[PDB]
Design a protein around this ligand. Sequence first.
Ligand SMILES: OC[C@H]1O[C@@](CO)(O[C@H]2O[C@H](CO)[C@@H](O)[C@H](O)[C@H]2O)[C@@H](O)[C@@H]1O
Ligand SMILES: OC[C@H]1O[C@@](CO)(O[C@H]2O[C@H](CO)[C@@H](O)[C@H](O)[C@H]2O)[C@@H](O)[C@@H]1O
Ligand SMILES: [Mg+2]
Length: 580
Amino acid sequence: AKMAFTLADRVTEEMLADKAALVVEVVEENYHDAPIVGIAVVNEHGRFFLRPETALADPQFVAWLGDETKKKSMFDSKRAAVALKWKGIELCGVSFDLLLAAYLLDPAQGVDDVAAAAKMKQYEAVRPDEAVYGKGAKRAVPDEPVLAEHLVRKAAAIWELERPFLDELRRNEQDRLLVELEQPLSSILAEMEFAGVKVDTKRLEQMGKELAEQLGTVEQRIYELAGQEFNINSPKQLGVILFEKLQLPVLKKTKTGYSTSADVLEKLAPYHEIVENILHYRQLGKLQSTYIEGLLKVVRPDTKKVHTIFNQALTQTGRLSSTEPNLQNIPIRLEEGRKIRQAFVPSESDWLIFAADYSQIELRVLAHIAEDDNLMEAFRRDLDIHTKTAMDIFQVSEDEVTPNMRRQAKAVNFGIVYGISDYGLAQNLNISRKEAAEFIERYFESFPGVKRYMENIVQEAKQKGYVTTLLHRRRYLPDITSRNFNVRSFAERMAMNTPIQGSAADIIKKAMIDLNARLKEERLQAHLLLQVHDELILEAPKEEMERLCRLVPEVMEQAVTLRVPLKVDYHYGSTWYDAK
DNA sequence: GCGATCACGTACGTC
DNA sequence: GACGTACGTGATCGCA
Ligand SMILES: OC[C@H]1O[C@@](CO)(O[C@H]2O[C@H](CO)[C@@H](O)[C@H](O)[C@H]2O)[C@@H](O)[C@@H]1O
Ligand SMILES: OC[C@H]1O[C@@](CO)(O[C@H]2O[C@H](CO)[C@@H](O)[C@H](O)[C@H]2O)[C@@H](O)[C@@H]1O
Ligand SMILES: [Mg+2]
C-alpha cells in the first residue's frame, strides 16, 4: 500500500500552484544551519518529491517559496523557515501550521510530528517520524525511496487535515488565535532565533578560570572538614558523609534516600561548617557546569553567537520554552551568577541591549479576571503589591509593615496565583499547615473577588472540561473530576493558575507582534533577541535608545486593554547585565 | 565483557 | 504554577 507521487528530477510549474501543503524536511533536532534532506509538495495537481540540492537551486522554486501570494500549509514552519534563512532563502505565505493548530486544540496531546496531529482526526496514513528516522542515537535519514514516501505522506496528511483542524479551531473560537497570534509570532521567533545573541567568550572563559580555582579551594576545604575525599557531586556519597560520618540530623528524605537539597542544607548549616562549604560548592559548580561550560559548548565558534530555539508548541499554559541553550534561565538572583549576563553583548559595535519587563503582570491579570475591587484599586494606585497584601492580611498601616511581613505577604501572593494549598504555602514559608491556612483565609477576606474567582473557575473547569485565557487559549483538565484528592487538587490549582499565566502569555505574544510592526513602521534597526515570559530583550544602535524608551513600554502596555493598567519597566546598557 | 546509550531520580537555574 | 540542563547511577543495548 504505497502512496502515489512523482519523484521529480526537476521543478515544474504545476509544482508551484498558489495553494499547497509543503514539507521542507530538517531531521536534525537543532535546525540551525542544518541540512534540508528532502522536499515534498502536494497540491491540486498531485504529489511531488524534490531533492533539496536541485529544488533550492531552482530560481523559480525559490521565488515560489518567497511569494507571499503562494499559500503553503505546513507542520512546524519555523523549523523550515530558519533552516532556509541559514541558506539565504526566504519562506513566505505560510497560511496554516498544523503543529501550532494541534497545539492550540490540545497542548496536553504533546503533538510533535505530523502523525501525532493526524491521529487526533483518525488519520493514520502516515508514520511517526521516530519510526522512520529511529531514536536519538540511531537516528538517521533513510534511503531516498523510504524518505520520499514519508515526506509525501506527511504533506498529504497536512493537505487533508487543514480544513478539519481549522473547523474545530473555529468552533473553539480559536481561529484568530492561530491566524492572528501564533502564526505571525512563529515568523518573529524565527527571526529572533536566526539573529542569535552575541557572546563574549573571552569573558566566559575568564570566569571559568576563576570558578575553577574557587572550586578547587572549596573542594579541598570540604575534604578537610569531612576528613576524607569523595564525590561531592554524588547524593549518595554526600549523604553518607553528612548523615552518617558527621551524624547530621535527617530532616527530610527522598524516595531514594537522604535529601541534600539547598533547602535542607541551610537548616543543617549551624551544626557543621562543612554545610556552608557544600552550599557554596553547589553554587559555583552550577555556574561552571551549566552556564560557563554549557554555554561555550553551544556558541558558534565563527560568529560567537548562540542561537536558541523557542519551542512554541510545548507548554500547557501557552508560554514559550527555550533550548540549546536555554536563554530563559540565565542567573540573576545572586550577584555571582548574575555576572554571567555580562557575557551577553550587542552583535554590532555601538549597539546596546534594551530590556523591558511587565511589572506584576500575573497579579494585574488576576485583578482583571476576578474583578476584585481591592486588587484593582491597588494597581490603579500602582501600589507596591506585596506591601499592600501585608497591610491587608496582617491588618497594619504601611509604615507598620516589616521586612519579614512583606516577605511572607509576597509568598502568599505567589501562592494565590499558583492556587497553592495550605501545605504548599507552609512548605515554602517553612511554617505549619494551620498557620499557612490562616494567611490564605485572611487573604480571601481582603480580596473577596479573588476568592469568588477561584471558586467559580474550578466549577467552570468541571462543567466545561477546560479553562480558557484572554485570547481563547484552552487547557483541558480531566483530572478535575478525579476522586483522588491529590490528583483532583492539582487539577484545581491548574484551573486557577492557567487562566492567569496563560493570559499573561497571550499578552506578551501580542506585544511582540505589535512591537515588530511598530519597529518596521518606524524603520528602526532595533530588533528582538529574546523573550523571557514577562520580558522582552532587544538590541539596537545606541542612537535608538531614546526612541525605544518611549516606544517599547507603550506598545507592551497597550497590547491589550484590561480593567487595570499594564506597567512596563525598562533599562539598557552595554551588556545584558547592564540592562538593569 | 566493554564502550555507548538509555532511563530516571535529584538538584537547581528562570519567571 | 510553568520550564530545561547537568549529574550520578543502574540498566540495557550492539557485537564478539
Ligand atoms: O522545531 C521545534 C519543534 O519541533 C518539536 C517536534 O515537533 O521539537 C523538536 O525540536 C526541539 C528544538 O531542537 C527539541 O527540543 C525537541 O526535542 C525535538 O523533538 C516541537 O516540540 C517544537 O515545537
Ligand atoms: O466548599 C467547597 C470548596 O472546595 C473546592 C476545593 O477547595 O471544591 C470541592 O467542592 C466542590 C463542590 O462545591 C467540587 O466541585 C470540587 O470537586 C471539590 O474539590 C472549592 O472549589 C469549593 O469552593
Ligand atoms: Mg518583571
